Nucleic acid binder design. Sequence first.
DNA 1: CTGCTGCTC
DNA 2: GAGCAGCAG
Lengths: 149, 151
Amino acid sequence: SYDWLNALNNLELSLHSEILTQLRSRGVIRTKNNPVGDYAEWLVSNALGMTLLSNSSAGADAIDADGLKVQIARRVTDNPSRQLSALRNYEAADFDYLIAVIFDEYNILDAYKIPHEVIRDYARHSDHVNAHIVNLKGAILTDPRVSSI
Amino acid sequence: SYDWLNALNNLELLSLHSEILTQLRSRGVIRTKNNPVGDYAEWLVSNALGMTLLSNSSAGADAIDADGLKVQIKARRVTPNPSRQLSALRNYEAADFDYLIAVIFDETYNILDAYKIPHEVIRDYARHSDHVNAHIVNLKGAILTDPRVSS
DNA sequence: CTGCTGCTC
DNA sequence: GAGCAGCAG
Ligand SMILES: [Ca+2]
Ligand SMILES: [Ca+2]
C-alpha cells in the first residue's frame, strides 16, 4: 500500500532522492536523470550481453557482441505520446542499430530494434532543437526492416 | 532512516518513484512526469514570491509576478556533478522574459543558492550551442560577481 | 510540428 | 566548452 505517503509532507516526499541513491548504488542507474532512461540501458545491457558506453556523446550507448554500436526509451503509463529522445548529427552514421522500449509508469510493454536506415524514413527535422525527431507510433512499428524483442 | 528500501527490488523501487511523483502531482506540487526539481522549483518560487504559473511554458517564461512581469524559472541540483550549467534558452533572442530566476538545490531539495538574474545580464555571459540551437549559461564566477545580479 | 525540463564529461 | 536523458501540448 502506497497510501502512507499522504502523511509525509512535500519536503519528505527527499525520499525520491534516496531511491535514486539506492538505484545508483545498486548499478541500475548512473546519472541523476529520469530513472526510465538508465534503467532501459541497464535492462538491454544485461539481457543481450552488451558493454555499456558512458560516452553517449553524439553516439550510441552500447556495443553488441558483434562490435556494433547501439543507441538506447519512453514510459507511457498522463498524456499518451511516444516521441523518442532527440537524435542529433544523424547524417554521420554514429550507430549501427537502435533499441527503443516503452515502459508503463516501469514495466516493459514494447521493444524494437531499428537500423540507422529505417530511421531516415521515419524521421523529421526540427530547426528549433536541431534534431531529427521520431515517434514510435504506428507505421514504423510494422516495417519488417525493424525487429521486436 | 531509509534502510527499509533495500527490501524492495528494482521494479518496486521504480514503481515507488513514479507513485511518489503522482502524489506531488495530486497535491499540485508538480505538473509533469519529468524531474520533480523543476516543477517543485516553479512551485516554490511562485507560491512564495506571489507569482502566477503558465503551463504554456513556451514564450521562454514560466510565470508572471505581482508587478506584472514575465519570469523564466530554471532550477538545478548540484551535489559535490557540481556543474551549474542551466537548461537551454532555446529562444532568448526574442527576449520573452524580464528577469530570470535560477535556484540551486542539493540532494535533499534544499536551497543552496538562488539568484534573480536580469535579461541583459543574461545576454552579457551567454554562449550559443550550434549543436542544440540554444543559448547556455552557467552560474559560477563572473556571473555571481556581476553588480546587476542579486540573491 | 510546435514546445518543455533537468543532467554529464 | 562539448556533450545527454526523458517529457508536454
Ligand atoms: Ca540513449
Ligand atoms: Ca523552466
